[PDB]
Design a protein around this ligand. Structure first.
Ligand SMILES: N[C@@H](CCC(=O)N[C@@H](CS)C(=O)NCC(=O)O)C(=O)O
Lengths: 234, 242
């Protein structure tokens, strides 16, 4: 219950992140949190000891998974889905700052960003997770099952790859080496949501540098960003 | 592969309003319709013929790069195009909010918005997909894999447990909040003690789970009442029916 008295004298400001030393989705919030300049504690839970299943924590995230973020300033608000946490942070920053950093003050851009973000957490992350399970942890080796998800994951990358190619193509049509982004010709939580998972697809035989050119650049760019490194060391 | 029809659509696009690209067996398609309907937004639905490869129409893969449904076009906003059911809902509730002043199925307070998304993502991230895999192995995979079918059926029963537990707490709340009992059948919601897109998002699928052998009414009491109130609403009925 190391989480108990952590709930009897909580901070007056700042944030407390609930992640795991390997949870890619946990890294999603770290990166965004660092990028926006928010100061935050980080509590790494141990799945094996079942800590993400203990009472005091599912009181924070009923689903009992990571990440989960306590917003101390907002009277210790609890947000749990990584996607929910990102939209909360960029919203929170735009409200305090007046500058849509990693976000957008335009409605059509927000929709396009939410689109790529929902697509990421629902069509990209889950499938990868599934691919990982059948290749490394499922109670039995079943190729058809692994192929299913690795294939789907390639379908997804093909989607983003073609998307980035059109953006590039659009840029290059500037005949009178630049980074490309999914929305608004600017980096947003739409792009950063993919990096944590992009760095792990090799464990399932997907070579981005060889298979997805525009994606390799897109992600080489994000990986070179301090915050992404400044919090990817586990 | 005949999408000569879909191509015609993109040359003569309506002035303003909304067009929805869905399919008669797409729960997520109806999740959109249901909300598009609760907010009073008029719209025409195009049911893409996947068998004819209409979802591969170059014109359609520009609106929705992922060639999947739903997909909503906001003609009013210069034919803008949103493609994730979750992204479509948020578009609607925000659009509705700045155009009326009243956040129907939404919330005007930052906190409540975070809590609504939480459930919303949970529904699009952990609910729909697992139900899609359970359904896949139990019915369409290339071979029988009982362990794969059990794995996903369990996840669906586990996520349902989360919602059920969530709704149970909300009930206990209201109760010991005016009984200082009859109020054991007063409508309850996930956030703000009001119906929101957080709640509605689930109804389309909640009628799909019998196919994987889950009996909500017998196994999820709180969920059962929850879905039944939403099902009695005129706007919901019109949506699922059309
Ligand atoms: N839909 C959630 C997924 C949460 C999730 O599955 N998190 C993983 C870590 S990436 C976890 O908690 N795994 C522990 C387990 O499954 O027991 C999100 O995107 O935040």
């Amino acid at each position: 219950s190391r989480i108990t008295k952590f709930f009897q004298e909580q901070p007056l400001e700042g944030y407390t992140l609930f992640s795991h030393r390997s949870a890619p989705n946990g890294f999603k919030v770290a990166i965004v949190l660092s990028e926006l300049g928010f100061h935050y504690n980080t509590i790494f839970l141990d799945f094996n000891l079942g800590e993400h299943r203990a009472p005091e924590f599912v009181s924070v995230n009923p689903n009992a998974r990571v990440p989960a973020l306590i917003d101390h300033g907002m009277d210790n608000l609890s947000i749990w889905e990584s996607g929910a946490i990102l939209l909360h942070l960029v919203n929170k920053y735009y409200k305090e700052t007046g500058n849509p950093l990693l976000w957008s003050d335009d409605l059509a851009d927000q929709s396009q960003i939410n689109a790529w973000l929902f697509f990421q957490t629902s069509g990209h992350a889950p499938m990868i997770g599934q691919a990982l399970h059948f290749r490394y942890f499922h109670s039995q080796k079943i190729a058809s099952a692994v192929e299913r998800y690795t294939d789907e994951v390639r379908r997804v990358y093909g989607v983003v790859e073609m998307a980035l190619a059109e953006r590039r193509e659009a840029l290059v049509m500037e005949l009178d080496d630049y980074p490309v982004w999914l929305v608004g010709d600017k980096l947003t939580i739409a792009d950063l949501a993919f990096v944590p998972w992009n760095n792990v697809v090799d464990r399932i035989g997907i070579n981005i540098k060889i298979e997805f050119p525009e994606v390799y650049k897109w992600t080489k760019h994000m990986m070179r960003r301090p915050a992404v490194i400044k919090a990817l060391r586990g």
